[PDB]
Amino acid sequence: CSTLSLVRFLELGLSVACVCTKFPELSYVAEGTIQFEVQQPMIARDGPHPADQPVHNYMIKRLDRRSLNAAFSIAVEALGLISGENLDGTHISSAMRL
């Protein structure tokens, strides 16, 4: 036979790159935007800054979404023997279900 050596993500090295936090209700609240800006530093230059609009130092960042897919086909005889519908008390049937 052949085992399946599973791998844990956190125990990898790449984990240091991103922070992973379990947010359960994302699939529901993702219907809109979240839209948090971060920052920007600014040097205090000499000479008086004019009385105008461009004091922008808070560029915004917007969420993006991603999914993941998997297929898990199960045969028609399987659930037959699983659900006890196609079952007889014989040792044979009590084994094929296993």
């Binding site: 205090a44 008086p48 800054h49 009385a51």
Partner: protein
């Protein structure tokens, strides 16, 4: 050098002023500097290109 020049930091001032539905107050702090070194006290050189 160590004591290249003396540098006097003043006190902060504001200018409370509003413009177009917005408070626009600025900040200021006068300064002054003087080199307390007889002869040159700082040199530089062009290292790379």
């Amino acid at each position: 050098e160590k004591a290249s020049e003396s540098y006097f930091m003043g006190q902060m001032q504001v200018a409370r002023t509003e413009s177009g539905g917005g408070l626009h107050l600025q900040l200021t702090q006068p300064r002054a500097n003087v080199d307390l070194g007889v002869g040159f006290t700082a040199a530089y050189a062009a290292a790379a290109l």
